[PDB]
Amino acid sequence: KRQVASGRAYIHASYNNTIVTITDPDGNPITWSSGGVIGYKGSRKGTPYAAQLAALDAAKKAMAYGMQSVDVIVRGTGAGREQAIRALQASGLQVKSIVDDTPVPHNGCRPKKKFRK
């Protein structure tokens, strides 16, 4: 019970999962979804398919609030990153634009051993 109808779509994509959050233009979230919100449990959350279902669940819940068009913002490089975008592409939502906001350091913080090299 809001009636936002125009908003942002944040796609947070790791190698382990894909989380679609949908917000009003000021960034405050109305609904969200993930590979784990969809029935999946294990590694399968980081699946392109899982990403598709995440996105469509999110988009559905958004349109229920009255949502029309989104601004897509992609963070993270993972499988099903593009599948999420392609999912919202025709979700029954217009995609007004896509930005890649993936955070990068100017080299301030030491990585976990797994990420070093």
């Binding site: 992609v74 634009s97 896509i98 930005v99 890649d100 906001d101 990068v104 100017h106």
Partner: protein
């Protein structure tokens, strides 16, 4: 690639040490705020070296971005 054009060619005469000229310097940044390599800027070693500096100065002053959000995609 980078054969679209070189930056040095598109611009005329201009002052590399001038950190306050925004329109001149912005031409040397990518979609992001990144400083283009020479194969883009078409500068020389000495040139590119001074460019890096003055671009950074401009950044601290707030005239140039440190980084910028990638659109389209």
């Amino acid at each position: 690639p980078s054969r679209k054009a070189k930056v040095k060619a598109t611009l005329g005469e201009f002052d590399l040490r001038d950190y306050r000229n925004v329109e001149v310097l912005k031409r040397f940044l990518s979609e992001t705020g990144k400083i283009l390599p020479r194969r883009r800027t078409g500068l020389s070693a000495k040139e590119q070296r001074i460019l890096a500096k003055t671009i950074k100065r401009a950044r601290i002053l707030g005239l140039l971005p440190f980084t910028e959000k990638l659109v389209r995609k």
